[PDB]
């Protein structure tokens, strides 16, 4: 996989070039914003169970057909698999946040997931709804002003939202 830094390096190597001053400054700013990134990962991870459970409860309340006998989340084995997928997606999204790059999310989760659900008969559109709910909860938690040194994390939240939307689009 690649993180934000390795990404710039890979691009430079393909060109056979040392980094420019404009690039060095960009990477230096990523480092300066590191604390905020670590807070976001810590906060989301620390609330992973409730983010998943609340999103699942919301999804099944809005789409009861999923849990009705014959629905894709009916039976404990199926429900367990669905809850597992939600935690897996959230897990990989947090990896992307730490890395500052979506490569790990795309490679080890997203790619091939749409075809996986189609083969199973799992409604990808509903999975997307679940992912959007976890977005909103994750961002509210990560960007909660209480108990943290005041500052602007708007750019980071936009980045985080992007990873969630990327996951939602890969299954929808």
């Amino acid at each position: 996989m690649l993180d934000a830094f390795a990404k710039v390096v890979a691009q430079a190597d393909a060109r056979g070039e040392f980094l420019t001053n404009a690039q060095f400054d960009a990477l230096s700013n990523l480092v300066k914003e590191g604390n905020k990134r670590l807070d976001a990962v810590n906060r989301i991870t620390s609330n992973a169970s409730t983010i998943v459970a609340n999103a699942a409860r919301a999804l099944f309340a809005e789409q009861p057909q999923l849990i009705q006998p014959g629905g894709n989340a009916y039976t404990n084995r199926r429900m367990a698999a669905c809850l597992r997928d939600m935690e897996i997606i959230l897990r990989y999204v947090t990896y992307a946040i730490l890395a500052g790059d979506s490569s790990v999310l795309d490679d080890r989760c997203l790619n091939g997931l749409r075809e996986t659900y189609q083969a199973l008969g799992t409604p990808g559109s509903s999975v997307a709804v679940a992912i959007q709910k976890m977005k909103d909860a994750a961002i509210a938690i990560a960007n909660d002003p209480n108990g943290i040194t005041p500052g602007d994390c708007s750019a980071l939240m936009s980045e985080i939202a992007g990873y969630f939307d990327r996951a939602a689009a890969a299954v929808a």
């Binding site: 996989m1 690649l2 993180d3 830094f5 390795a6 710039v8 390096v9 890979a10 430079a12 190597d13 056979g16 070039e17 040392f18 980094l19 001053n21 060095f24 990477l27 230096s28 480092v31 590191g34 604390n35 670590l38 990962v41 810590n42 991870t45 992973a48 959230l90 897990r91 947090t94 990896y95 730490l98 890395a99 790990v104 080890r108």
Partner: protein, 162 residues
Amino acid sequence: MKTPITEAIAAADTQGRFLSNTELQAVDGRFKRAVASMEAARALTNNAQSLIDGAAQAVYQKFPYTTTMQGSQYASTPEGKAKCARDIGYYLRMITYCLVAGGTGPMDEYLIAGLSEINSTFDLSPSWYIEALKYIKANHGLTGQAAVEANAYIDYAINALS
């Protein structure tokens, strides 16, 4: 690519776990060390040409035969001299990449993997490159932790050639 961040993610992923404080500290370490690392990378990059030119000439001075011996593996021709300068530039570029990425990844992937094969097939002496690296280490002009960061990767390359 191997870096303090991808290693943290790889560890968590292999265990099918969310990142823990155990990994978040490793990344913090990387962020704090980045200050010295970037200082080293910028300096090496800014003085890349003189370091490369000086390093090539350290090699030719240590091994005079590389400038006179007949054979495409030597720098006794204009083409050979260009190949050598190119190679030394590759090593220096890789060192700056490692400093930027915070790990050996870059060098591991783009240069070390297959290195032994390459040197063997094309009859290139590892000792030539070790001498160039020693010159860069002795003359990069860095001090403090910036020097420590630069030397760590230069020595990593030397060990890979040993």
